[PDB]
């Protein structure tokens, strides 16, 4: 690439993997969102919580793809595996899965940051810092808060309804 | 002091002690507020209730320091001891501690007022009356109301959630 | 903590110490501010300069406490020692003490950043960079400028008056 | 008086004396104000400072006369003695005289308050508290601040000019 | 050049030299400006005075380059020598250097105008008259005024502070 400078092939490849992770996460949240839109689940607040996350994750992927091109790396797309579940159980089950999911994204972010440090790629580090690292931390704190409130509320049916009505 | 008039050394010293009490109270509410901001406590309404109180108590201290200077007394600051607890338990536990705290502030206000009467310091008395005495009484009534409602709600997890959602 | 990830116990403890440092600094500026509000000192511009700093330092502490919770660390509060002085002398004396104070805060920030690097905690590093490091540098430059102007003006009484009137 | 209730003849008489004191003070400030308006004194800021005080003192007298009538006391006016000086010297001289003056007013206020306590006249006490006591304290603090700044500035001619230009 | 008409090679070359002079002047003012922004100099008004001049001189150069092209002359750029000093001393020192600098620019303008007369180039003369000659005269008068006021003020530290505060 005529523009490529200080951009290691290792980071380039890891960015492509992270794109796949973010699109996988988006797909997972799409599935979560529509599960809670089921007539036999019917928790609209939960559906909107996860649909908004699907969108955030997709935008994460796009931001990465844009940066990939800005550095002169080459996007390589791979198959996107389907979410790990077809049905997601209670709001509690779903929020637990989501936080596991976010932690895995966060760890991939940290790994990519470590890679960038090792490759002495300060632009990559700045990029991760500005658009991802604090985002993840805040999201995970939020999910932690929700988990705690969901769990305080478990009259399990009553609790699930109230959480969706009054928090989500 | 060129401006000092009818301001006893006893009141001056007691005002300095009260400043320390108010800053101690502010510190206590800071600790309360951030405890409820913990991901494993997660009661945002409670966190905001106590953070607002931290701010009120700090402003109380400042009002006292300003009056101290207006009378030609000399501010003397002392170490501020840390709050009595590191973790504050339930909203009920926390509100009980807060009302104990406010009662102690109120008693210090009353003591200072008695001192002012004994020292025949009508400016001090007016000052306490305008900016503190009714404030405390109203705050303590509010905390009393909350305690009663919190207690009515003890499904303890459910009650704590509902109180935070619908009152705080 | 359910949310805690890549947050070392060393950083957690150092963040708690830094909170104590920032609250100590806030307390010091409170004392500075009210000293200059004394009828026998009477430099309103200086009083407002330091009172605004007290507020900035308190907000620094709060930002740290919020981040502590966001990472799943646990706030631990300690006694706050009283400021190093009861009276602060001239504006020059006071500004010299303030810059010593800011340098000590800045050094604690740098130490904490070094700790974060050693612990490979990129979120911590981003956090310090966004909300503290440049803030300190700018504040210290400002105090440096003031010190130089104060010193140019030492007709010491005249100089102190003019600085407060025309700069502060 | 058909309306008179709990209003002692002692307080009534003391209110009349205080009216005379306030009108005397107003007259003194009138003299101060116009002295600084002299072509050979020419300190417009000082002239306006004292003219505004003349007006405040006159309004104090009126407030007292209104209260006198509200309680069913009878205003009795006496000769108003001329101010203690015909020329007031420097701004420093003038501000020193003013603070002596305000202290004497404040002491008369305190005496009247003590009288009211002894006579168990809570309306009188409330009246003094709302409209005079804090007013005096604030004014005296202000004059204290000015005295300190004036004195810091004593290049006596230069200092007097700068104070008037930059503070008054 | 297809457009070149009545534009002597002598004027063309002299315009290129004048561009170098104006860029040199801009560089000198950049250095002046940032010197006064030093924490140990700290005269913000002086810094802004010289930074604005740096910008004016750069725009002078650009205006000349534009005219060069409008006449069908060819811009030829040369090395720009660094300013004559690294540190500029007092405001007085700096303003003296600036006026020497402006006089040298003005003389180069006059020389170029004389050249234009000799070459019977009325467009060049009009150009210098409209955009430079009166500009220089006004700037030099301004610097003359400042020099006189700076010098009246030499309590050298006090004077330098007051000039920056009240004139610049
Ligand atoms: C502007 C609103 C966007 C809302 C997006 C919400 C959820 C996204 C759901 C699934 C995305 C996962 C895989 C789809 C593959 C590519 C998406 C195209 C990018 C886009 O479509 O941009
Ligand atoms: C919103 C205005 C804030 C102005 C603050 C200015 C000065 C703060 C002075 C002292 C603070 C130092 C110790 C007090 C302990 C806790 C403060 C409560 C937090 C808050 O009170 O938030
Ligand atoms: C509405 C503007 C009032 C400005 C007053 C400023 C200075 C007052 C000066 C002298 C007053 C002292 C004795 C005069 C006696 C009675 C004043 C009439 C009440 C009034 O005149 O009300
Ligand atoms: C629009 C704001 C302009 C502010 C300019 C202020 C100072 C200029 C400082 C140094 C210029 C001297 C040499 C630089 C060489 C070419 C400048 C590019 C022209 C431009 O940069 O135009």
Swiss-Prot record, chains A, B, C, D, E:
Q: Which SUPFAM superfamilies match?
A: Ferritin-like (SSF47240)
Question: Which Pfam family, just one, is annotated for this protein?
Answer: Ferritin
**Positions of the Ferritin-like diiron domain:** 5-154
For region Catalytic site for iron oxidation, the annotated ranges are 52-59
Which positions does UniProt annotate for Fe cation binding? 52, 55-56, 59, 62
**One annotated Gene Ontology cellular component of this protein:** ferritin complex
Q: Spell out the subcellular localization from the entry.
A: Cytoplasmic vesicle, Autophagosome; Cytoplasm; Autolysosome
Main location, first listed in the record: cytoplasm
Superkingdom field:
Eukaryota
GO terms classed as biological process: intracellular iron ion homeostasis; iron ion transport
Q: Which UniProt keywords apply?
A: Acetylation, Cytoplasm, Cytoplasmic vesicle, Iron, Iron storage, Lysosome, Metal-binding
Q: In Gene Ontology terms, what is one molecular function of this protein? A: ferrous iron binding
InterPro entries (UniProt xref) = Ferritin (IPR001519), Ferritin-like (IPR012347), Ferritin-like_diiron (IPR009040), Ferritin-like_SF (IPR009078), Ferritin_CS (IPR014034), Ferritin_DPS_dom (IPR008331)
Q: What does this protein do?
A: Stores iron in a soluble, non-toxic, readily available form. Important for iron homeostasis. Iron is taken up in the ferrous form and deposited as ferric hydroxides after oxidation. Also plays a role in delivery of iron to cells. Mediates iron uptake in capsule cells of the developing kidney. Delivery to lysosomes by the cargo receptor NCOA4 for autophagic degradation and release or iron.
Q: Which family does it belong to?
A: Belongs to the ferritin family.
Additional free-text comment from the UniProt record: In horse spleen the light chain is the major chain.
Assembly information from the UniProt record: Oligomer of 24 subunits. There are two types of subunits: L (light) chain and H (heavy) chain. The major chain can be light or heavy, depending on the species and tissue type. The functional molecule forms a roughly spherical shell with a diameter of 12 nm and contains a central cavity into which the insoluble mineral iron core is deposited. Interacts with NCOA4.
Q: Which PANTHER family match?
A: FERRITIN, FERRITIN LIGHT CHAIN
Q: What is this protein called?
A: Ferritin light chain
């Amino acid at each position: 690439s005529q523009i490529r400078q200080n951009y290691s092939t290792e980071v380039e490849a890891a960015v492509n993997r992270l794109v796949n992770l973010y699109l996988r996460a988006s797909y997972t949240y799409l599935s979560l969102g529509f599960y809670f839109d089921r007539d036999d689940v019917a928790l609209e607040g939960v559906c909107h919580f996860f649909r908004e996350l699907a969108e955030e994750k997709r935008e994460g992927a796009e931001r990465l793809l844009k940066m990939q091109n800005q550095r002169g790396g080459r996007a390589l797309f791979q198959d996107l595996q389907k979410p790990s579940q077809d049905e997601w159980g209670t709001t509690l089950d779903a929020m637990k899965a989501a936080i596991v999911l976010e932690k895995s994204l966060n760890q991939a972010l940290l790994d990519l940051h470590a890679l960038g440090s090792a490759q002495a790629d300060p632009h990559l580090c700045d990029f991760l810092e500005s658009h991802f690292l604090d985002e993840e931390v805040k999201l995970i704190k939020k999910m932690g808060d929700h988990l705690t409130n969901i769990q305080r509320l478990v009259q399990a049916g009553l609790g699930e309804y109230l959480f969706e009505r009054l928090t989500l």
